[PDB]
Amino acid sequence: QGTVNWSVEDIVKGINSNNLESQLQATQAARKLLSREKQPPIDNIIRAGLIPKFVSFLGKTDCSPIQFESAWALTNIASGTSEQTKAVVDGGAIPAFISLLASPHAHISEQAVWALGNIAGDGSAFRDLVIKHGAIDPLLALLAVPDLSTLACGYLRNLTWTLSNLCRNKNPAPPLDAVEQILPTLVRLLHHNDPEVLADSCWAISYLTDGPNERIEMVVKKGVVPQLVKLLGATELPIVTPALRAIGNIVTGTDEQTQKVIDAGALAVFPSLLTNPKTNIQKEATWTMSNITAGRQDQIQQVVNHGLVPFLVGVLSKADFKTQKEAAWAITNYTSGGTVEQIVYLVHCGIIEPLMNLLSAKDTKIIQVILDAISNIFQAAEKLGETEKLSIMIEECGGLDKIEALQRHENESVYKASLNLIEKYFS
């Protein structure tokens, strides 16, 4: 096969000949160039003025191979910078690719799915432009099968991916009714048994849940929460990561929505998520915990009965800083909504020492966060007449020095909190 390594000017020559075959051959040369690992000459291809020509080949139904080669060619240009994508879009590729969705040749519509995927992936505008040109109907149609197993592995992977991009980006979020239209198929995909369909399904859902409550509610209302929780316990990190994000998003919404996650059994996975070797899982799991401890006392209670407080204490005691920061918050949140008993309980789990050690971190934000929390804790200890035994505690682990040296920390609300705390509990 000597359509290998052509020069651009050669590709041009051919595509301009009035010879459908010569053109087919050159377009394949074009694809091959663009498929190379080391810096495919996308720019010069664009610069050569080729995009419109490829675009018009998409429409050549007699000559399927050219349809495919040009499809692939544009697919690859469309995968580069935004500007590269913009060039594909400016050529009129979008309705052309949509038309190809119904091509009788699977390998061709797959290419069309792929390209629409890249275009929608550029960002919200292209995404909604794909949507306006009516891509969503024909995509869904290819998934209109009694059993998803009967479709080819990488064909379904591509559709799942493209679909996820139609759910991706946020300013603005995708159109509500486009989401309504996608959801049922997404749900059906969230249940399929390919690790890769599951990862992308999870992302799709994670994107759609990253907004205001009404959005979360669309999702939660299709009852995917049980199924998200299950996935949360998967062995494949490519699946845990996006599932955990979905759940993390959902618990930012109403307490009602939060409770769906609790009922689903979510909390049971946390012992292991809060100890996970992958740094980011831990950060994200901890964050999620912070949004649960931000809920009602009976929700705080469920965190307690799953024995997650030790896990928080653990995370406060040793994790990379960014996780410890979330633990800090999770605790403050806890100490805000919590009952007296519950705040007591936290201290009996040994929350005071590891909290104190963090006061010497040089991150201004977290210190406030911790001090609000100490504040909060003394408050429950006042209601019990125990501000003493607690002060003593904070002394014996060197917390007292750390706060008492903190009136001379620059920040305003900082030195006032410490000031207050010192005055109020320490003389």
Partner: peptide
């Protein structure tokens, strides 16, 4: 995962 190139 934004965008994908082929082969």
């Amino acid at each position: 995962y934004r965008r994908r190139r082929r082969y």
